[PDB]
Design a protein around this motif. Sequence first.
Motif, PDB file in Angstrom:
ATOM      1  N   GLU A  68      -1.161 -24.057  13.122  1.00  0.00           N
ATOM      2  CA  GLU A  68      -1.147 -23.391  14.476  1.00  0.00           C
ATOM      3  C   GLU A  68      -2.193 -22.059  13.867  1.00  0.00           C
ATOM      4  O   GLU A  68      -1.722 -21.320  12.983  1.00  0.00           O
ATOM      5  N   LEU A  69      -3.377 -21.736  14.805  1.00  0.00           N
ATOM      6  CA  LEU A  69      -4.209 -20.493  14.502  1.00  0.00           C
ATOM      7  C   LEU A  69      -3.103 -19.408  14.378  1.00  0.00           C
ATOM      8  O   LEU A  69      -2.090 -19.482  14.501  1.00  0.00           O
ATOM      9  N   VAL A  70      -3.696 -18.172  14.087  1.00  0.00           N
ATOM     10  CA  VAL A  70      -3.196 -16.889  13.905  1.00  0.00           C
ATOM     11  C   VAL A  70      -4.059 -15.680  14.161  1.00  0.00           C
ATOM     12  O   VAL A  70      -5.148 -15.776  14.039  1.00  0.00           O
ATOM     13  N   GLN A  71      -3.317 -14.624  14.441  1.00  0.00           N
ATOM     14  CA  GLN A  71      -4.053 -13.381  14.759  1.00  0.00           C
ATOM     15  C   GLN A  71      -3.907 -12.473  13.715  1.00  0.00           C
ATOM     16  O   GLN A  71      -2.871 -12.093  12.939  1.00  0.00           O
ATOM     17  N   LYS A  72      -5.086 -11.975  13.106  1.00  0.00           N
ATOM     18  CA  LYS A  72      -5.265 -10.960  12.233  1.00  0.00           C
ATOM     19  C   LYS A  72      -5.916  -9.752  12.510  1.00  0.00           C
ATOM     20  O   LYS A  72      -7.206  -9.761  12.777  1.00  0.00           O
ATOM     21  N   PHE A  73      -5.291  -8.525  12.115  1.00  0.00           N
ATOM     22  CA  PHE A  73      -5.787  -7.149  12.408  1.00  0.00           C
ATOM     23  C   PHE A  73      -6.127  -6.377  11.334  1.00  0.00           C
ATOM     24  O   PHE A  73      -5.171  -6.490  10.355  1.00  0.00           O
ATOM     25  N   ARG A  74      -7.201  -5.475  11.456  1.00  0.00           N
ATOM     26  CA  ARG A  74      -7.142  -4.545  10.282  1.00  0.00           C
ATOM     27  C   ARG A  74      -6.500  -3.353  10.544  1.00  0.00           C
ATOM     28  O   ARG A  74      -6.534  -2.468  11.642  1.00  0.00           O
ATOM     29  N   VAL A  75      -5.525  -2.928   9.649  1.00  0.00           N
ATOM     30  CA  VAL A  75      -4.609  -1.745   9.496  1.00  0.00           C
ATOM     31  C   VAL A  75      -4.345  -1.133   8.249  1.00  0.00           C
ATOM     32  O   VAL A  75      -4.383  -2.032   7.132  1.00  0.00           O
ATOM     33  N   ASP A 107      -4.540   7.657   0.950  1.00  0.00           N
ATOM     34  CA  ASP A 107      -3.501   6.969   0.174  1.00  0.00           C
ATOM     35  C   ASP A 107      -3.222   5.790   0.818  1.00  0.00           C
ATOM     36  O   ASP A 107      -2.855   4.557  -0.175  1.00  0.00           O
ATOM     37  N   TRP A 108      -2.850   5.490   1.803  1.00  0.00           N
ATOM     38  CA  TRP A 108      -2.445   4.226   2.506  1.00  0.00           C
ATOM     39  C   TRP A 108      -3.638   2.895   2.181  1.00  0.00           C
ATOM     40  O   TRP A 108      -4.672   3.103   2.480  1.00  0.00           O
ATOM     41  N   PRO A 109      -3.289   1.981   1.664  1.00  0.00           N
ATOM     42  CA  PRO A 109      -4.008   0.857   1.149  1.00  0.00           C
ATOM     43  C   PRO A 109      -4.274  -0.150   2.260  1.00  0.00           C
ATOM     44  O   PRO A 109      -3.388  -0.355   3.033  1.00  0.00           O
ATOM     45  N   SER A 110      -5.666  -0.541   2.413  1.00  0.00           N
ATOM     46  CA  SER A 110      -5.926  -1.065   3.855  1.00  0.00           C
ATOM     47  C   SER A 110      -5.188  -2.510   3.493  1.00  0.00           C
ATOM     48  O   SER A 110      -5.533  -3.316   2.648  1.00  0.00           O
ATOM     49  N   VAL A 111      -4.597  -3.051   4.638  1.00  0.00           N
ATOM     50  CA  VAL A 111      -3.823  -4.021   4.774  1.00  0.00           C
ATOM     51  C   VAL A 111      -4.216  -4.878   6.036  1.00  0.00           C
ATOM     52  O   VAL A 111      -4.960  -4.330   6.818  1.00  0.00           O
ATOM     53  N   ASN A 112      -3.453  -6.145   6.379  1.00  0.00           N
ATOM     54  CA  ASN A 112      -3.927  -6.663   7.571  1.00  0.00           C
ATOM     55  C   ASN A 112      -2.529  -7.478   8.172  1.00  0.00           C
ATOM     56  O   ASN A 112      -1.719  -7.707   7.436  1.00  0.00           O
ATOM     57  N   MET A 113      -2.513  -7.149   9.388  1.00  0.00           N
ATOM     58  CA  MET A 113      -1.231  -7.680  10.336  1.00  0.00           C
ATOM     59  C   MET A 113      -1.536  -9.128  10.640  1.00  0.00           C
ATOM     60  O   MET A 113      -2.285  -9.494  11.536  1.00  0.00           O
ATOM     61  N   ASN A 114      -0.613 -10.233   9.960  1.00  0.00           N
ATOM     62  CA  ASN A 114      -0.425 -11.258  10.168  1.00  0.00           C
ATOM     63  C   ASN A 114       0.366 -11.739  11.311  1.00  0.00           C
ATOM     64  O   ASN A 114       1.656 -11.697  11.156  1.00  0.00           O
ATOM     65  N   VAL A 115      -0.084 -11.867  12.412  1.00  0.00           N
ATOM     66  CA  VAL A 115       0.862 -12.189  13.628  1.00  0.00           C
ATOM     67  C   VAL A 115       0.488 -13.522  13.899  1.00  0.00           C
ATOM     68  O   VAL A 115      -0.325 -14.070  14.606  1.00  0.00           O
ATOM     69  N   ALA A 116       1.616 -14.450  13.860  1.00  0.00           N
ATOM     70  CA  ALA A 116       1.664 -15.860  13.820  1.00  0.00           C
ATOM     71  C   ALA A 116       3.219 -16.218  13.909  1.00  0.00           C
ATOM     72  O   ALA A 116       4.326 -15.661  13.615  1.00  0.00           O
ATOM     73  N   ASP A 117       3.150 -17.533  15.066  1.00  0.00           N
ATOM     74  CA  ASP A 117       4.619 -18.013  15.308  1.00  0.00           C
ATOM     75  C   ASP A 117       5.656 -16.793  15.215  1.00  0.00           C
ATOM     76  O   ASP A 117       6.802 -16.928  14.965  1.00  0.00           O
ATOM     77  N   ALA A 118       5.303 -15.618  16.066  1.00  0.00           N
ATOM     78  CA  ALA A 118       6.215 -14.296  16.383  1.00  0.00           C
ATOM     79  C   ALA A 118       6.809 -13.958  15.114  1.00  0.00           C
ATOM     80  O   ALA A 118       7.827 -13.471  14.968  1.00  0.00           O
ATOM     81  N   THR A 119       5.912 -13.675  14.058  1.00  0.00           N
ATOM     82  CA  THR A 119       6.031 -13.191  12.843  1.00  0.00           C
ATOM     83  C   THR A 119       5.078 -12.128  12.293  1.00  0.00           C
ATOM     84  O   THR A 119       3.896 -12.356  12.399  1.00  0.00           O
ATOM     85  N   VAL A 120       5.655 -11.072  12.112  1.00  0.00           N
ATOM     86  CA  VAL A 120       4.843  -9.678  11.680  1.00  0.00           C
ATOM     87  C   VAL A 120       4.998  -9.619  10.295  1.00  0.00           C
ATOM     88  O   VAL A 120       5.793  -9.148   9.661  1.00  0.00           O
ATOM     89  N   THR A 121       3.963 -10.228   9.512  1.00  0.00           N
ATOM     90  CA  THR A 121       3.797 -10.322   8.351  1.00  0.00           C
ATOM     91  C   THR A 121       2.706  -9.403   7.560  1.00  0.00           C
ATOM     92  O   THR A 121       1.525  -9.832   7.917  1.00  0.00           O
ATOM     93  N   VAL A 122       2.816  -8.181   6.863  1.00  0.00           N
ATOM     94  CA  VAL A 122       1.457  -7.274   6.506  1.00  0.00           C
ATOM     95  C   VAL A 122       1.023  -7.840   5.280  1.00  0.00           C
ATOM     96  O   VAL A 122       1.555  -7.602   4.091  1.00  0.00           O
ATOM     97  N   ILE A 123       0.034  -8.449   5.495  1.00  0.00           N
ATOM     98  CA  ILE A 123      -0.739  -9.169   4.085  1.00  0.00           C
ATOM     99  C   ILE A 123      -1.824  -8.216   3.827  1.00  0.00           C
ATOM    100  O   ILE A 123      -2.561  -7.669   4.441  1.00  0.00           O
ATOM    101  N   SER A 124      -1.791  -8.159   2.352  1.00  0.00           N
ATOM    102  CA  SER A 124      -2.856  -7.236   1.692  1.00  0.00           C
ATOM    103  C   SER A 124      -4.400  -7.811   2.379  1.00  0.00           C
ATOM    104  O   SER A 124      -4.496  -8.892   2.908  1.00  0.00           O
ATOM    105  N   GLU A 125      -5.317  -6.760   2.040  1.00  0.00           N
ATOM    106  CA  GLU A 125      -6.400  -7.219   2.407  1.00  0.00           C
ATOM    107  C   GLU A 125      -7.096  -8.241   1.557  1.00  0.00           C
ATOM    108  O   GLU A 125      -7.456  -9.248   2.009  1.00  0.00           O
ATOM    109  N   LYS A 126      -7.387  -8.037   0.459  1.00  0.00           N
ATOM    110  CA  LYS A 126      -7.846  -8.944  -0.675  1.00  0.00           C
ATOM    111  C   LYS A 126      -6.930 -10.014  -0.662  1.00  0.00           C
ATOM    112  O   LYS A 126      -6.943 -11.528  -0.878  1.00  0.00           O
TER     113      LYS A 126
END
Length: 185
Positions: A68-75, A107-126
């Motif tokens: 199932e596809l997923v939504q990724k945002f830059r934050v 100081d805040w490390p660039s991360v990515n918001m992984n929004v899938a199956d109603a799940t908010v998981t902040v996955i690192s950039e790289k």
Amino acid sequence: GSSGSSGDAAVTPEERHLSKMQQNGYENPTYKFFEQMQNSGPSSGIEGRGSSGSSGSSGSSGPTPKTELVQKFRVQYLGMLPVDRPVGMDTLNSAIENLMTSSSKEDWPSVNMNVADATVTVISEKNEEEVLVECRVRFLSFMGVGKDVHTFAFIMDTGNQRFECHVFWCEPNAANVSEAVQAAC
């Protein structure tokens, strides 16, 4: 940080939606259900004595997980701030300023918001298997933005009546984010 504009001619369709999140915020219904779960009340009858109590957990698989596809945002990830209340615009916001002063903007490390199956998981950039933070909407109690739309935070439950408030920077605004996460609810 002192926020405030001198004036304005017209309002954008992105801000208006953000204003609401600034007013009170967004409360998750499920959380409430998990607490008071409707059940049968056989209490009525000729039974008013006896002591019992058991526990267990049965397991059984069935269907198979599909792709199932997923939504990724830059934050960015400011950090985690402990709170005493599960909700409250005064609680979430307060945390923001706390983490803001803790570390700088860079100081805040660039991360990515992984929004899938109603799940908010902040996955690192790289890093994709970093899972810096793991949050589940179904558990999310309350969420909202800070004095500034650019700032987006949310409260999650970890365990033992515990609540954590994480902050994340969005660009340009947190309208595309506060909307993607809400839809999951």
